[PDB]
Symmetry: D3
């Protein structure tokens, strides 16, 4: 989308063209991966599941003693302002990135910070029709594991992403699009950047999320499934259960439900019936005037 | 603390940029994802201490994450040299060379869609660490060093929340630095320095299977063996620490820092073996050893 | 409480003045930490949740093949007699301690015990100060872990307590009052001597208890919560979920619900609304003529 | 030995007849298993490897912030005095037990201690005969890693070991063998474990068990006699196919192992016999490791 | 199983042939013999009905899929193998069959699954096997082996395979402790299963069994759980300890071959065999397997 | 489509006689009861040995591993070591092999009264099978090098399954191989439970970094004869050997890697997880030459054919 060349990026309250959207080399985010972020989608004038995203950011920031320096409402207003300044109402997404701040000297220690969080919001136009993603993802189960929370709590949506990127790198070399990752016990946990679901015998299966990002999209699809009386098995399941699944798909804010066409070269039919049903339910939900979605105000 | 640091010029992608303007894109993999490797080096009496050892670690770490540095070792070395030269630094300085995957078309974790090359940044700063080192308080964090199938701590990367989180806990315990156990509960390392204990005239340190394998650590081990001090490199416990004669940490920035307590258990700071190894280390880094790259 | 100086302690069927209440240096409890115990609270003539305590003791004793050498009723009678001998009817607590017995030689081997189990009951006056009048515990999450049951089953309420004391020692040196402990997987398990609870958005959260003492108080508070329609999250939760909690508190027979004012230096407002509601429910429950509480004669 | 009925036990500086040797029910040792101990053997007027034992006690005490309240010399003197008071010169053993002390109220918290550490020393006669050999069963219960409970500590908290022993006894065995968290052979519940394979001694690294003085002695004697010792990770398979096995501890010395999990080994194999003779010679010698009685 | 002279003369299905017992053979190059490379099911024939037949076939198809083993038959055809093996032997009642499907004959003996001449080897051993209540009622002695159930990233014990040394090893240790069967803990130390049967305990009127994350998910196990819930017996399917076993009121094990077998001790800790809830569930199970339920495949 | 298990096709292999329980049986007729413990349960141990210039390479070492493995699973082989040796010798002799051959000796617990796991139910003694085949693995066939993928499936600790056992229960290894095959690789590399490099699914793994040979401790994999030989040859030639915990990072930055086993000797590795390594680097070539010299010598380790 050619219009992406002319977007303004929010950087510490300045609206800046992409080629000039910059942060100090001393920023905690650049030096140390020291920050938390959220991606949100804008559909028909509404930021999808906005509060759920902001809640995860406030929880993640709290866990790393990172002062966001704004109330929830103010942080929301950053995103709102970024969409308004770009004239975006629909078919957009934004990545809100909050890093500890600019450091007196590049090192890990958070006490060496000049106070004031770095706040960046990258808003962009995008789009993809439901059976145009007809291209299922190929998944490869990486040898690199999800961590337990005494090592690194994967509920944290952080700027420290090498633990996930490394699994993706391995999956790419296996000819896959995305890594599936096991938890420390060997049960299926999640993909490197999306949550993983299987369909077995009319039932929806996904991990407990004890060892992966608990995506807002994952949460929404679970809820939609239960509300529709689809049985949901949220708990420990294996690669054997995946290879024998009827369908599989991944979830995340950027693409919604993406069908999976194979796992470790084991074929699954992309876009099976239950994927189709849940996708329709999700598409309806994100387009509705549901109170979970924050209506973008008109400009002043 | 040194007023000259306010005016240093930072290497960014071949340009020397004043401190307050030295910037990287918000789309850079280092900012978005902590996706990069770095090395810190110390400049002593015109010589970059253990320069090659630092560069080899960077090349191996970059290789591990399929990050093309986009430079030969000689070129990379030249970046650091040039950064010191541009700042008129000959002694009492430290530099952090940071290499991140590069500028992405869109901010996300996927390494594939990189416009252009690796981002290369070098921050040099005057950093005199006086021996006048009252000894660190350590607290053993509840947060663990990972095994290499989760996150290989030999990597010196821009993804450091795994270490920072241990440090945060130690800070709230009233300590200066976190000590970290490995997945089996043996002593591994500190959050930003390697850890050593002294027991009965012997030097003890972890195997390094689960922590950064620091250059300083390696140097101190080597000096110890060359001086006929016994070195136990292997699994040891909190109990062995609490009953030690001495303890100290190692890193490029500070050299040997004495430890005055671990989990509130007092140790006499700067014991005899710490003092000897410190003298050996200061001698070594100030010598015309072939391990150190002379500035022009 | 000055009265505590003069209490009589039950020792093997005798009432013994406190300063003379003694056990052989050959006792399995002393040599080896080899025994199980229960703490019970006496409130308004009633031993709180007495049966629940006794059932834990019988299960724990069974797990280490320790024959208590008494029926459940008889064991209860020890505690009853200990309170009655000391003229206690309210405001008291007792520790019933049952160790394997006197050994022919001091070593770990449980065989070759002279006689039966050693039975000791220490009753003492404690005023439990009102809810409003304590400003909350500081917790530090120790580096020392709760064990899995193939290493040491923390459901066991035993005389072998260095595994818990070690975590407490570390927490004390961090400036805290009590240790929080993670399980082998890194999820929150319990404190070193009390069970741990968090409140997150009007909901009560506590571990599954797979890796800690399953306290009677814990079990009571879970049940009270559900009976009151407070949602209860019993399952795996993290330090992150604690640091972002609205409230936290710990449970045990000695103090009831004790509010938590911080965890690893992260402030929590002590005695938040859900702590206060559950405390009122618990204080009501332990003072009621519920059938779970054994009336003194 | 009938003489054991009349021994005097050291309790806090007093020598107390056996049947009156007592500790408060408020003692940290009784309430909580909160203390450290050492077993020592007296051979031909010498306390075997005395300093080594005391050093482990001081290290263990330090790990649990237990103040013994005595210098090393004083602690040694308690044991010396206990043997002297009982007229023991040979064929005796003592257990020195140091618990945190008397509590104001029975609970786990180490802070509320009236006075100093409780110090108890039980000395007893035992003749150690020149012996059927132990049956060992590998318990399902594991040695812990040091972030759960460090088995180098020789403490009064012993149910973690007793539980393994209980399972072994019900399997018809005399002693539990115990694996480490990774499934490698670690130790027995109360003695260190050795296997003999191909002229070589095999024992665990000791990362996950008590580091016994006897174990250390046997390793050294083996190397001085040119028997190699492989201290490392080894498996049940390597035990079941061993030529011999034995256990070590202060109480019995080298005890042969005659089976593990029902798999027969030699009732007393040649290298066990050699090392036992070397050990008996060593503990009877005027070595500087042994503290001569007055 | 009660001694039965008729078993000496049974015909075994081998690759479409009915072969007398003493001649029923497979190539030394077969993947099953060289490598334990195959999946199997045991089924019980009661009053002309193969008990829970589809459930067994479903497990076989999932297990074969997990190891990329093509059974080379439709489910109907697979069923017909079993049917034919019972019919050929004139069995209508009081019989059991083991259906074994191995990857096939190899070009050379090695582990590599690619080197297969021809299709899967299919063997069906049917035998008269009444396990009398006389024989069963007194109960098994269990010993908790030191050898543990694996997590699914090492070996998924839901697989019913020809690679059984991981189970046999536990059993060998139990046999030498004077026990009949090994009980096995999972990697975390919780009770998982026996070496060849699923394990249940009864505590205070409630049925306890493991979650099955670390053991074979037996058909009989699943049937007993369902009968318990249908009878309003509480079921605690979850993590429990040896302490909870040693203090249980009753214990029993389940499997196709013997049904519910009472446990008389675990690690030498006595349990009264055939307690009231074991007897109730046993009565419910015997009723169920003898009924015209649609889960059971009627012989023609 | 590549194995580390491939060798020159050899028409003579159609007609070999297989030892089965004391008989020599034509290949197509060489059979075992469907009640055999090996078929039902994977219940047996095996050894593969290579015949070079009339000498069975490292024969005693193979036999010792078999006897130890059989002991570990209480399997009575029912033959002395000399008898067992003689079975393999006789199998090579009966097929006229003196060179360029490999045998797999398979000993399973025996015929069961009923197919189940219980080892008590055994009629008679152990089943003994020996399959000898002409198997030349040329250096030409090897020069391309194997592609490794690090499987998600891991080597077990010995309290789950002791990988020093060379058993008929091989789905634990085959599963890792299946995953590697679908990644486009020839063989699976496997990590140990701690995440350190352990072994391949059917061969031992080595890396070369800076003139030094690196291989795992072997605490968590088959302790191959070939592996042990290569370690000793390296030490004897003064090449430093790092036997201990190393990582995927250490592999991806290696100068060379190769795998070892009886069937192929030293096979160079060309990539691990898509990370290229030059196949047949200088230290692989030196160790290969040392190994070929060693297996062709009259070393005391090799069993002379009569
Ligand atoms: C699993 C495994 N790895 C590697 C090898 C290679 O070892 P060797 O050199 O002894 O054939 C073997 C031998 O069978 C093996 O079984």
């Amino acid at each position: 989308d050619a219009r992406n060349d002319a977007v303004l990026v929010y950087v510490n309250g300045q609206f800046v063209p992409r080629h000039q959207a910059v942060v100090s080399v001393f920023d905690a985010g650049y030096v140390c991966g020291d920050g938390v972020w959220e991606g949100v989608r804008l559909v028909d004038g509404r930021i999808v599941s906005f509060d759920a995203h902001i809640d995860r950011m406030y929880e993640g920031a709290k866990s790393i003693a990172l002062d966001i320096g704004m109330t929830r409402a103010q942080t929301k207003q950053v995103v709102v302002d970024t969409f308004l300044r770009n004239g975006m109402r629909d078919g957009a997404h934004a990545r809100l990135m909050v890093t500890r701040g600019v450091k007196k000297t590049p090192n890990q220690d958070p006490r060496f910070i000049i106070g004031g969080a770095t706040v960046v919001c990258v808003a962009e136009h995008k789009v993809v029709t439901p059976e145009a993603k007809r291209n299922g993802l190929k998944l490869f189960t990486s040898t690199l594991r999800c961590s337990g929370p005494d090592v690194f709590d994967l509920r944290l949506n952080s700027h420290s992403r090498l633990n996930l990127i490394q699994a993706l790198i391995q999956a790419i070399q296996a000819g896959a699009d995305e890594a599936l990752m096991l938890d420390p016990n060997g049960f299926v946990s999640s993909c490197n950047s999306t949550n993983f679901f299987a369909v077995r015998n009319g039932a929806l299966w996904t991990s407990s999320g004890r060892y992966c990002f608990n995506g807002i999209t994952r949460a929404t699809v679970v809820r939609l499934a239960r509300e529709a009386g689809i049985p949901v098995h949220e708990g420990d399941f294996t690669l054997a259960e995946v290879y024998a699944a009827d369908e599989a798909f991944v979830t995340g804010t950027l693409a919604g439900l993406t069908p999976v066409s194979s796992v470790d070269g084991r074929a699954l039919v992309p876009l099976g019936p239950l994927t189709q049903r849940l996708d329709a339910l999700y598409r309806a939900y994100i387009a509705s005037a549901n109170e979970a979605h924050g209506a973008l105000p008109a400009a002043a």
